[PDB]
Amino acid sequence: NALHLEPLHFLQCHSRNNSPKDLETQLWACAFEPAREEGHSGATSQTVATCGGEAVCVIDCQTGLVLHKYKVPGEEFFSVAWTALTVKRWNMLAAAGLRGMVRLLHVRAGFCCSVIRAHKKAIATLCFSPTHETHLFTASYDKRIILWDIGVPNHDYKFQASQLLTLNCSSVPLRLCPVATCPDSFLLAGCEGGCGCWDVRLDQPQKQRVCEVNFVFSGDSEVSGQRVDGLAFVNEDVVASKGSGQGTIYLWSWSQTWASRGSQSVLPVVILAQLQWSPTSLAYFSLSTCPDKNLVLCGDEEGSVWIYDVEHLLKQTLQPPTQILKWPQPVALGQPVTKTMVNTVVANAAFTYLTALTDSNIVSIWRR
């Protein structure tokens, strides 16, 4: 336990039919709330939004209490994302999934402000611009990524959303990731068919845009054209990305890759290092990062969290994790939950709280 992490809570709060027996609902996404005041980093945020089944929960990591819950019959929520708006700061929570609708929650006030019918198919994931807090990307099974401006809320807390760009994908988009050094100019997306970069500059005049560069990670025909289901920046230049069935997380340089590009629409990335991850062929284990601590985080099919401190690596063969945080088999209904999978793992920016979501209707909360 080199990172000195301890399990704090295992919350069963997305249960179907309000049942204590639900140890099966898949939890799909989680996101720490920003600071509640402008100018604060929010790095020690201890409030996390989670979604799964018909529900979005907002949880205090410290106490484990569910502060807020939003439930929509017949929805299946796949993605949550926060944005800090200036109205005084309002922390808005966007939630979406099966129904193709973005539901904008004013959490503190206790209600859903507005709903955007963004797609006619499910939304796989949502992502706000870090710099233009009203700009929202929605990625859908209709093989589009749409960039929205949700606008300012009117006096009665209503939003009038407009469409800024449509990004056309050759396969379903799974994971969104703005380019760290130019997040309103280029967007990365991990898709069922690999990882791409789209030009999202609004000063270019085309409104429907195909991928500018499709990336290549391996010359192995066994992996060519395979999904990229985890994608995040470890620091301003270095991207961590992965697919399934490869036992590997790739660390690559945005700047060196982009510099090599020219006009090529298909481009091998400049790889900096490769990390050993689980060998599972199972799909949709996403990764995340904690840049301030130089960490990559990725759950696996046994419910472990692989943790990599890549500082020394990136300053100077598959590299091993720094720590593998095993599933601690907490007791439910008096019996150990001996098996689960952790498909999403997210830490606050200071790495004082870590949340690991399972396929067992359990939100795992660890403290450092």
Binding site: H9, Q12, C13, F111, V331
Partner: peptide, 18 residues
């Protein structure tokens, strides 16, 4: 090791409404 804590709808502190 904490056990799994069930949080039912009546245990939530606040429900968000439409």
């Amino acid at each position: 090791v904490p056990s799994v804590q069930f949080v039912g709808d009546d245990d939530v502190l606040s429900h968000i409404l439409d």
